[PDB]
Design a protein around this ligand. Structure first.
Ligand SMILES: [Zn+2]
Ligand SMILES: [Zn+2]
Ligand SMILES: [Zn+2]
Ligand SMILES: [Zn+2]
Lengths: 378, 375
């Protein structure tokens, strides 16, 4: 009777740009409006690298990770229908549906459930401890995933179909879903339009497969790596551009060559490199172009050419690709049940949490796209 | 069609003085018309011209805001006539190019803004009488001259019943602010707008948002004179940033917006500090920001955290006003007295007294200066 304290393993980082030590932690039971999760899958992202380097807010010790999927192990009072056994996916932000921003239908940034950055629960305390010393550990985003057990608020999790493959649901927790949703929530790629995707990572592959299903004629993929060029061709990419092959020319005028000088209709910057947002703007059409800066950079500011302010383009800032976690997100997950979008080519590497120090150097490999973290039940 | 010899305001070197010179105006060749200037105005772009911006070209005749009557036409000129009243356009509207067909922008492909100071010939129609030295013009047509030769596709046939000191004012400044309230971001009924900088571009936005049905029109300025002119055009709230040193402009705007912000924010100053404040004063996920004014600097700094706020940053040129499709409508709303531009006029000078216009523009009670010519 009544759930209790859970002890398990987790990935913990103690300093900025420091090592990720696997620690024996102590997870408290879930209190009011909270649920406890047993992790099934996890994944990496550049955001997780920013978390280990103190960006945006340096909080330590921390259990990184935000991409993942799990099963409800225990619930508190007022779990809003959530029960043990439900396969849930952590959310970057909820959707009450009744706030001023949710009723407009033009944004996914709910006023009641915004993204979290305190690294703690709503009551200012942490559910997770160090089983040896007792130091409370900050979680990440709204729920850490690089841990065997985690506690999260019931409004920051989404109950999903028990049929979806658990690696697939993890790849839909952040990267691919953000790139997919950006092609019809922030800016709407119409039939027979030009689209240039800067950086063909898991976020870029979502935009490519996104622009195809909407009917984009030209889908330009601009990445440093030939290894990722082939994986873009499978999701519907029409043209490819490599900045190394032409050092005298910039990426902006390289896209302007394949588009008859006009540029593309929608640019999706997915790398976060500071020099590339200015190239994304110049790559879009004059007057009717649109740029969606999806990639996140590690520095506090971003510079834009002052003459672009006269170019009449549209700079649509975004979070989670504009996907509404309660309205639009379940629509994307069922598209892998019908396999309209198929996410098998995303997985390239696989590790277990015991070798999570390995994952940071694995993501540096040129042939790397997605890293899946599994948990051995022992 | 002869060769007229008239006066003109001439800059001779970077950051130098502007002096009157007896010039000579060549006849208009093909696809050209030449105008007898009725009156003129000036703004910050003309101050930037004397200092060598964008491209330093000297000797030059500055001035771009004005209105005149066509005096000599060269055919292949889209059917204009002597006796028509024209105003110079900063850019053009073709009508058949892919951007004009789109209807979402005024930045036409065929007639973009020029930065050469000469005609399509590469030669100028204006030269000094004594020295015969050829003089660059400004934008697509110089205005601080009694006679100027411009391309026919860069002038607009306007309703001759409009007043001259009003058509010149509606060639740059007021329309850029007025047109930005529906061409760049559609200010809906019951919405909230915030104007950063209540100059005269801010007065265009304020009167623009009022006719669009905006509930709260918040103005931000450190000058009580601009605040008074602001309420005249329909400003509902005023925020003097110097009244609160321990608060930012965005925080003060949030206090008047139930902590959310405004729907439409219009950055009319150009200082880099206020661009990040314009984004911060807009609404989360549904706010839009329009950077109208320029700072003449290299880049513009934006906070990385703003990239997640779901806000819309809409760049603009001439306030999104299409030179041939939207500007005649704005002249109608001023002809039908829907807009009152009488409070825009503040000072008056003659062309012979052009050097004083640069010192008048720095007066705090100054709004728009009117430059008149002799017969
Ligand atoms: Zn991620
Ligand atoms: Zn909501
Ligand atoms: Zn002007
Ligand atoms: Zn055109």
């Amino acid at each position: 009777k009544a759930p209790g304290v859970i002890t398990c393993k987790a990935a913990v980082v103690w300093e900025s740009s420091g090592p990720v030590v696997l620690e024996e932690i102590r997870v408290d039971p879930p209190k009011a409006s909270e649920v406890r999760i047993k992790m099934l899958c996890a994944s990496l992202c550049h955001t997780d690298v920013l978390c280990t380097k103190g960006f945006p807010i340096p909080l330590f010790p921390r259990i990184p990770g935000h991409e993942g999927v799990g099963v409800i192990e225990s619930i508190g009072k007022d779990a809003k229908g959530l029960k043990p056994g439900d396969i849930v996916m952590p959310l970057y932000l909820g959707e009450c549906g009744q706030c001023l921003n949710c009723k407009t239908g033009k944004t996914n940034l709910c006023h009641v459930y915004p993204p979290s950055f305190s690294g703690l629960m709503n009551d200012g305390t942490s559910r997770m401890s160090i089983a040896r010393t007792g130091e409370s550990i900050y979680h990440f985003a709204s729920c850490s995933t690089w841990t065997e057990y985690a506690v999260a608020d019931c409004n920051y999790v989404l109950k999903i179909n028990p049929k979806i493959s658990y690696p697939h649901a993890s790849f839909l927790s952040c990267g691919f879903t953000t790139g997919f949703g950006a092609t019809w929530r922030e800016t709407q790629v119409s039939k027979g339009s030009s689209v240039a995707v800067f950086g063909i990572g898991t976020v870029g592959l979502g935009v490519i497969k996104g622009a195809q299903l909407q009917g984009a004629s030209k889908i330009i993929g601009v990445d440093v790596n030939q290894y990722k060029a082939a994986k873009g061709k499978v999701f519907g990419m029409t043209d490819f551009i490599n900045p190394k092959d032409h050092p005298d020319k910039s990426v902006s005028e390289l896209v302007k060559e394949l588009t008859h000088g006009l540029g593309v209709d929608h640019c999706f910057e997915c790398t976060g490199v500071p020099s590339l947002l200015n190239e994304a703007l110049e790559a879009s059409k004059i007057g009717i172009g649109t740029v969606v800066p999806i990639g996140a950079g590690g520095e506090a500011s971003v510079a834009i050419n002052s003459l672009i302010l006269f170019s009449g383009r549209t700079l649509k800032f975004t979070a989670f690709g504009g996907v509404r976690t309660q309205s639009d997100l379940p629509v994307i997950i069922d598209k892998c049940l019908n396999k309209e979008i198929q996410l098998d080519e995303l997985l390239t590497h696989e590790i277990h949490l015991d070798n999570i120090q390995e994952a940071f150097e694995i993501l540096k490999k040129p042939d790397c796209v997605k890293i899946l973290i599994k948990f051995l039940e022992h």
